Amino acid sequence: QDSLSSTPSALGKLQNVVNQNAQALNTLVKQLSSNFGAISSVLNDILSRLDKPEAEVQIDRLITGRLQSLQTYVTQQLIRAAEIRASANLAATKMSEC
Amino acid sequence: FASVYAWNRKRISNCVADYSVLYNSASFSTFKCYGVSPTKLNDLCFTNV
Amino acid sequence: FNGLTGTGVLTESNKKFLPFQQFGRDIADTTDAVRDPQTLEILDITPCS
Ligand SMILES: *[C@@H]1O[C@H](CO)[C@@H](O)[C@H](O)[C@H]1NC(C)=O
């Protein structure tokens, strides 16, 4: 009890999971600020200025970039999920055997 | 009007801009817009023109 | 608002805007507060449910 209450790094393993997940979401949201070659990162600003054929060119650039950003996020989550599953399996084994 | 090598520039600010009077005119032979649609200009606001 | 378009619920803001500031921004580069161009009132912008 005294050790935990005086050791800031004692629960680093659990804090690391929280930090990594928060970081991933912050990255995903910040990608919405990228132009990806478009005149603007904001769809409403594109639609309010350009007509259909011109807007479509600009929108396609944003779709490509945002779709890639989302695919990156999901892939990383699947990999991290596998790591957590392995940890949970070990914890379950220790519960039974210890 | 100025010569093209010594072209004139005028700054326009702090005013209401009606662009339809120009676009719907029959007196202009060329009217081409870039980065913006000519039919949406009246819905927009700019810092300077 | 002065060419800034979007959809959401507008409410009175508790954000202490300075006299020169016209709008606030989120990390997604979206507007989450504006100054009304006629009343100079600060409004929060919340996305519709
Ligand atoms: C016009 O805008 C000014 C602020 O710039 C405001 O004080 C005034 O009351 C407004 N007039 C009307 C009719 O809204």
From Swiss-Prot, chain B:
Changing residue 25 to L: In strain: Omicron/BA.1. It comes from the Viruses. Binds to host ACE2. RBD also interacts with the N-linked glycan on 'Asn-90' of ACE2. Cleavage of S generates a polybasic C-terminal sequence on S1 that binds to host Neuropilin-1 (NRP1) and Neuropilin-2 (NRP2) receptors. Interacts with host integrin alpha-5/beta-1 (ITGA5:ITGB1) and with ACE2 in complex with integrin alpha-5/beta-1 (ITGA5:ITGB1). May interact via cytoplasmic c-terminus with M protein. May interact (via N-terminus) with host bilirubin and biliverdin, thereby preventing antibody binding to the SARS-CoV-2 spike NTD via an allosteric mechanism. Attaches the virion to the cell membrane by interacting with host receptor, initiating the infection. The major receptor is host ACE2. When S2/S2' has been cleaved, binding to the receptor triggers direct fusion at the cell membrane. When S2/S2' has not been cleaved, binding to the receptor results in internalization of the virus by endocytosis using host TFRC and GRM2 and leading to fusion of the virion membrane with the host endosomal membrane. Alternatively, may use NRP1/NRP2 and integrin as entry receptors. This is Spike protein S1. The gene is S. The chain holds residues 347 to 395 of 1273 of the full protein.
